[PDB]
């Protein structure tokens, strides 16, 4: 069909700056752990040492297959500059079939 | 209740520039295929002809109802500048009831 | 394990400007309703009084636990500048275990 459930996963994480986000995205592509990344600038807020702080970071969504999830989490844990980084996966319900094929081809290998 | 499961879907895709993202978003609204779109600038990375490339694009999330999903995918496939565009749907678990009503009203028609 | 299903929810909403998005994010943190927020600039389009309009807003994703969902929706409904704001939750499938612990600790209290 034009689209189907597929087996894509979307992993999200945030980084201290544009440079680090792009560098890690590139390293993940080199290892065929992701087929593509989309990064964007964000303003964040959270608790830190008893106070609410404002921060500027770069978020990134990583697109890959379910088969690469474990490896992706391990590589992100390896490369992340933060001690306790935000790393979580969102549920993908459907995906354009041709794109799913491209994702699969893009992550074939190591 | 204040919120419930609803029947909203979120479709994500990326475009070569701001102009194209907005133009397509407008065309989707004209056809009542989406109730709203949120677009933002992104930096992307993926494989292309054996090399890892960096790109600048505009991403967009399209908010509509489950009933419009098939039509939305067909219209996006029709208008997309890319040969193999990223088009996938994310799972929505809950939604403010009043907003869900607004979504339904916004996509009533053609 | 390195990651598991967890009990995190992601709530998304849009605001008229950067100032309002950050202010509300801060208020949600003060009440321990969210552990963190990530906000970014967006361009939006929707129907308004029979015409398709273009707008500039700031979107924000709120990260919290399933236990805080009801309270979060109530506080957002309380503080939102829009009469019919977009507020919905996305499904989180997996999450880095250490991060999940941080989320839980971050929302403990009121």
């Amino acid at each position: 069909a034009l689209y189907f459930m597929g087996h894509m996963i979307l992993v999200y994480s945030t980084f201290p700056n544009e440079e680090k986000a792009l560098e890690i995205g590139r390293k993940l592509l080199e290892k065929r752990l992701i087929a593509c990344f989309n990064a964007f600038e964000i303003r964040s807020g959270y608790w830190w040492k008893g106070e609410i702080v404002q921060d500027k970071e770069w978020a990134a969504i990583f697109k890959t297959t379910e088969e690469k999830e474990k490896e992706l989490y391990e590589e992100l844990r390896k490369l992340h500059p933060y001690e306790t980084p935000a790393i979580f996966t969102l549920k993908v319900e459907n995906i354009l079939t041709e794109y799913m094929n491209w994702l699969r081809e893009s992550v074939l290998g190591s």
Side-chain angles (χ1 to χ4, degrees), chain A:
Chain A
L2 183 61
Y3 60 100
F4 76 127
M5 322 72 68
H7 54 293
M8 159 185 240
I9 61 170
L10 185 168
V11 176
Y12 180 104
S13 189
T14 66
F15 304 87
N17 50 66
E18 183 185 309
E19 296 61 48
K20 183 61 64 173
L22 303 186
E23 184 185 74
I24 290 181
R26 175 186 68 63
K27 289 180 176 181
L28 294 175
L29 286 163
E30 290 188 302
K31 297 189 60 167
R32 307 290 274 185
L33 294 180
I34 63 172
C36 169
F37 72 75
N38 286 352
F40 50 107
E41 178 174 50
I42 60 168
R43 280 178 180 286
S44 55
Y46 48 95
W47 287 88
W48 175 267
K49 285 175 55 181
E51 292 185 52
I52 297 175
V53 296
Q54 181 75 228
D55 200 358
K56 276 195 181 179
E57 305 177 70
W58 266 72
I61 57 168
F62 301 113
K63 311 175 189 181
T64 195
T65 59
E66 306 182 332
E67 295 54 65
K68 301 280 182 168
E69 183 166 40
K70 189 179 184 299
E71 289 167 287
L72 176 52
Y73 269 78
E74 302 177 323
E75 193 69 23
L76 275 171
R77 172 66 281 183
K78 160 190 174 188
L79 306 173
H80 215 107
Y82 301 162
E83 182 176 62
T84 308
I87 304 182
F88 58 85
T89 188
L90 295 181
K91 176 61 183 303
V92 177
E93 295 294 297
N94 274 304
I95 175 65
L96 183 72
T97 306
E98 289 198 315
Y99 187 62
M100 186 64 11
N101 289 327
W102 181 79
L103 285 178
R104 197 173 317 178
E105 310 179 316
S106 294
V107 299
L108 179 62
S110 65

